Design a protein around this ligand. Structure first.
Ligand SMILES: [Cl-]
Ligand SMILES: [Cl-]
Ligand SMILES: [Cl-]
Ligand SMILES: [Cl-]
Ligand SMILES: [Cl-]
Ligand SMILES: [Cl-]
Ligand SMILES: [Cl-]
Ligand SMILES: [Cl-]
Ligand SMILES: [Cl-]
Ligand SMILES: [Cl-]
Ligand SMILES: [Cl-]
Ligand SMILES: [Cl-]
Ligand SMILES: [Cl-]
Lengths: 564, 566, 566
């Protein structure tokens, strides 16, 4: 006779490149029945300023892979890798040369600037050269949105008419998934074919790959379309679940809780409205699922919040062609992925979830309503938002702003405060709980103070942090950054922040900088900002491979944690 | 060790039930390296009046299957099968008992009457007991239509609005495919999973299985959604081709030509209208493809016929195309693009539902449900039209055939096609405009919108089997045969259906696919007929009843075991 | 327009048959956005003595299915189903008629007796009429075993020779999976295509579906070939995991622990022997995996037990492991590596066929068919062995449990395990060594090679249900219950089989999977039993007969509707 397997490279087995077929910049040293321990891997930097990648590998990983996982390779390169271990009481070491192939973008057309997204390192402070960032971005397909859910025909519709669409099946795009080091080099790549196939019409491999979040195992969960997944940094697909039959259109977030469950943001298919019309709802249901994909709980936000509140909805940018123009809501907006009130329209656009283990509750970011805590009991515990449009009983759940002495700050119904740096968040993302216990938000800032400004260039985004007293019902702004960076720091959409306790930085990714500059690539800007001094410790821009093509999120990733 | 293969049944190899996994009422006698010839198979009738199924098997089939194909088994039964052959100059014979399993309907809900479609034999004349009929029918899925093609947003649409749909992706249903004998017994079943999966959302396995037509090899072509296929009676899928990338929504017909090509009826995806809007067109493009799936030719009917002619379009029953049944179709200028009655590319202006290839002049004959019957040449020019004259403009008006009697003298008809002092009538919302073995044109004349109006009362409708003789040089048409006019609404199929002249016993075969379609709560009747061509006596009549109410059948075929295994 | 979804059946949504497409005798009442609680379903018995199936449905299930799951329907029948609930503080009820389709066996040939496995009720005591039993059985495929793993060529092999096989890929058969009631009626069916495709050569859909065991959620785990699964009684596939890349050939058992992990029985692929040859080992590795499919732990039994001990291996019936049946196994030094009786890694030296997790000390109890029953700790040390003493060396010899009577005084047994003046006997080629709800150890003692020899005549063999009490500190074992010894060869299962103590009615459940296996030309009997623990009265006896001759069953489970829908 046949063809023999690859022979051993050194003192263990063969070194296989991309063992699962989904990660071309990984490799595996086959164990070949050796009993080893105290395993450490080092991928050496390329060239003079090249970043070294080093990490331990625990027993479960060794057992799961049947070998030593090699992460952090460069593409198209004779990588130099050193593997150290203990065997039969003796200290052991091998050096390997691991040749790799190329990274391929399978989705190119006349809009392509080039095949890959270009990187530009702006700042890397001493002590931050080792940082890695997973960038969750995407690239347009040639055909664009080609599929729609079929909806229920309206009795007000024409007799001869074909039925309408419903839901958000068009929310579909090719993934562009990589890790970048502080030299702007790609050090990981998830094959686009892993989850996505844009040329076929299998809806199982369509959608918008989002909500990539680390698990307690050092693996990651993600959603795309009608499925959710788990995967690891060797490119192994560990889980692949269909959404439960009542739900559709999973986007924006997936997060594993401590209790072995996963929180997902979906819509409800065949939702019967009070007027008896069935729709697929938009971004307004939370599932808690177990690892069998069964529903442990569901929060239906159309019964918990207020689908009728258009305070922020009427103030939004219609371009987020009609860019700049404030959104004029219409009572006859057809059901679908469109700005509007009520179930069947995009009234909520929930884009992040955070689990509060202290009271078994969820904190949600509603792009179009604000930030809310909802209980296991399905009751609203608090709302962080400008007071306009909120009615009783929800109005009484609104958090009251206060200063550092605990004294009320005065603000109008639009969230403009007097004699204060305090401000609410507007069309925000990633409303999470930092390791300090505070609430961190990326405050994109479209429709700020429930209006569009005079000039487009007056908009700005903030990294913002709050301290909430749930008993007193008071919120304090304890930290902010970016207000004074202006238009080159404004991300109208997407984006993320997350506090890093290890080096006391606020990490951030602004995913849509310059989105509106027709014909220019969109900038995704990675930042680490010193929490104390506010000095920029890291800044790296990622430029889209086609013009006017937003990025979604990025994560700060840590090799020490990857291979438990 | 392992598990051994099935041991030999008799003097050849094992007998395997459903070798390809798509046809549970077939089996295969494995050749086990034997060299044989003059193969004949006989499947014996069940019980006292059971129909025997008997046929020869040619060398190509023996080689292809590596065995003797057994066709015609009853479900859930100890079938008695006899295979005869010649080996080493010696006449040989084996008798087998071939147990089979059940037929399964995978698509049932509260609408289901029971799992299978019921049969009712009405008439079987002496000498027609052997006839077998393949019924191309379907069964509703629990979810119904769940997917749409995404279209291009209208500049007149709301600013905030999501984009519209386009095309005909909701034209999607589970198949129900069997052969029935003259005792009403199922003698063949095509596993629904063969081509379809209504629970998964792989669009490659969605559509409406249609246009099942015999090939020169005794196999069959068919279309479903975005794919076309070829299969044989052992359940072997011989071709599975994606439509070429320009086209979508293949329905109604597939037919292999003498030239090794296949004619399909499709729509054009990303069709750019004169106003610059892109749509997926509806049922108005003909492809000629080769066995590599490549396009040999295309006929874009939006540039060949007249998509603005609404003479018949405005005269149709709203319920057909439940209850807005009985009501005449009122066309609107602002009907959104899609699978909707209306004029222009992007709407259902032609609804072409059959194709025939005229090998004599390398032309095609089409049935347009909403316009009439047309011959178009290789040169993409209209050669003739058979339709009422209303609505036709020049240059197409000059191509309309002129009705004449048996002596060849003009027949007087108004613009609506109502003729004076004559049996002649045009066809309306018709199907299967094919070329008989006599060279005449046979059509199933459904008769909705007859004489370009809805009648005074809803039950004043009738269908016909009809045959015409066309003189292409003179531009004249003669009606030379008809049937069904006197049978009234109980013989009226508002949609689907098919006829075909059978020379072997001089009958006209027919299947009315939608009898009593509008009878709220009643099964729909699919009526198989064979009508003696000379005497008009009913030689065969068999009724198939849908397994859910108000659920149409599409077509049926007269199938012949002697031809199935070349 | 399109095709609408099924309309509501009663006061909730449509009733859909077989929502996931894997379980034709289930249905779902769609919730259609209703808010309900206190759901109870009742499926009424068919005819006069028909068994009623009744159960509650919890909120997680309602949410997961977006509806009310209906379990227990009869095939091809107008089932009468009643669903009761509470909505808006008001007590509600609907009666549905749920028509179903047929059960299909997709794997039939000349060996088939008929399509389904026949049942025969022998005994049903008062108070046991409600019992349901899931039978994990299988049906031969036409082609048999068609694939092998490729191994490493031997240096002693011929120069020109192709490479050898390795591992156990031929351990591959179609599944036949149903639930039977006390009237012998099929009340659940798992579509064979759910996990298996014996006609295609996708090894991902090959294997021997086995180790079906309930989870803490009322769902079930299972293994087939190179994948492990979780499914529920609506036919929903909840997990499908490839084995981790180091391992192959998962058979016999899968069991979820309290810790959210699953224990599997596998072989090691590319196992490097001390002589440097690479083989896929056979049935001698235990994995603990999490729900991410990752390896939490592994037990390599080739380094823990003794692969050279041939005390039992040399004493076995050649026909088991047809006809070389009756003949004692003669081991050979040159038996090629593979699924073959023999010593050492690469051969079938252990054939481990059950796993049990002892949550009290985080240990595992294994049944090795060819060695005995063993407890191994988290620390990978043998804690105790239950086996005849012959062949065991030190250090393992000191771990052998010492037989004692009810007063705790030693019982005298020879090295072959034949005891004096005592009912005590060891187990031989046993299965399902599990921990009863009482904390005792229950085993199905098949009894091939009993007392480490083949008997004088072949029919001098018997099986037992047996239960033991183990004192781990003293290292002593007491036999506290047995049954089947007096029932002779007509109760002897040479292979497969299972017992399980049922506390709810104080019975010992059992399934003998291979009764009359060697009866050339006769179906094989799978005998379901429930034996009153106290009186030893037969409360239930039901026979399942294979659909082809000499075709073993594997296991059965006592299933409980009250637990199926948490
Ligand atoms: Cl270098
Ligand atoms: Cl290189
Ligand atoms: Cl190397
Ligand atoms: Cl036979
Ligand atoms: Cl029937
Ligand atoms: Cl035909
Ligand atoms: Cl138009
Ligand atoms: Cl007539
Ligand atoms: Cl009903
Ligand atoms: Cl039966
Ligand atoms: Cl169990
Ligand atoms: Cl050996
Ligand atoms: Cl006994």
């Amino acid at each position: 006779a046949g063809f023999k397997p690859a022979p051993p490279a050194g003192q263990l087995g063969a070194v296989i490149v991309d063992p699962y077929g989904n990660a071309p910049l990984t490799a595996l040293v086959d164990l070949d029945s050796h009993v080893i321990s105290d395993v450490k891997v080092t991928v050496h930097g390329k060239g003079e300023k090249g970043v070294e990648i080093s990490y331990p590998v625990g027993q479960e990983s060794l057992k799961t892979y049947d070998g030593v996982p090699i992460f952090g390779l460069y593409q198209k390169f004779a990588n130099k890798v050193t593997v150290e271990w203990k065997e039969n009481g003796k200290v052991m070491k091998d050096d390997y040369v691991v040749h790799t192939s190329a990274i391929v973008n399978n989705y190119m057309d006349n809009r392509s600037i080039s095949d890959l997204q270009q990187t530009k390192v702006i700042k890397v402070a001493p002590g931050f050269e080792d940082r890695l960032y997973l960038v969750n971005t995407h690239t347009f397909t040639a055909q664009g949105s080609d599929l729609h859910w079929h909806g229920e025909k309206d009795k007000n519709a024409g007799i001869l008419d074909a039925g309408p669409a419903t839901g958000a099946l068009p929310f579909d795009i090719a993934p562009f998934t990589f890790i970048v080091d502080t030299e702007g080099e790609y050090r990981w790549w998830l094959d686009q074919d892993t989850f996505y196939d844009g040329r076929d019409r299998d809806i199982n491999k369509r959608g918008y790959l989002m909500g990539i979040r680390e698990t307690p195992r050092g693996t990651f969960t993600a959603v795309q379309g009608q499925h959710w997944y788990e995967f690891d940094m060797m490119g192994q697909v560990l889980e692949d679940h269909k959404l439960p039959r009542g739900f559709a259109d999973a986007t924006h977030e997936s997060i594993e809780t401590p209790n072995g469950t996963v929180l997902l943001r979906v819509g409800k298919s065949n939702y019967r409205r009070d007027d008896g019309v069935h729709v697929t709802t938009i971004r307004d249901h939370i599932l808690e699922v177990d690892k069998s994909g069964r529903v442990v709980d569901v929060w239906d936000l159309t019964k918990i919040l207020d689908p009728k509140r258009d305070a922020l909805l009427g103030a939004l940018d219609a371009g987020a062609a009609h860019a700049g123009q404030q959104a004029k809501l219409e009572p006859d907006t057809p059901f679908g992925d469109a700005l509007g009130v009520g179930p069947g329209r995009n009234w909520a656009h929930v884009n992040s979830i955070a689990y509060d283990a202290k009271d078994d509750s969820i904190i949600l970011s509603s792009r179009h309503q604000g930030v809310v805590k909802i209980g296991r009991d399905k009751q609203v515990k608090w709302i962080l938002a400008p007071s306009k449009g909120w009615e009783k009983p929800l109005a009484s759940k609104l958090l009251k702003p206060v200063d550092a002495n605990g004294k009320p700050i005065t603000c109008n119904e639009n969230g403009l405060c007097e004699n204060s740096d305090f401000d609410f968040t507007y069309t925000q993302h990633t409303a999470w709980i930092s390791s300090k216990g505070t609430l961190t938000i990326f405050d994109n800032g479209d429709g700020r103070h429930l209006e569009q400004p005079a000039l487009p260039t007056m908009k700005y985004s903030r990294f913002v942090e709050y301290k909430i007293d749930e008993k007193k019902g008071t919120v304090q702004q304890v930290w902010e950054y970016g207000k004074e960076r202006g238009y080159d720091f404004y991300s109208p959409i997407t984006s993320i922040i997350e506090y890093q306790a290890d080096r006391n930085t606020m990490f951030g990714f602004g995913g849509s900088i310059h989105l509106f500059d027709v014909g220019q690539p969109t900038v995704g800007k990675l930042n680490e900002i010193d929490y104390k001094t506010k000095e920029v410790k890291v800044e790296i821009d990622v430029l889209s491979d086609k013009p006017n093509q937003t990025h979604y999120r990025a994560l700060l990733v840590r090799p020490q944690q990857m291979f438990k």
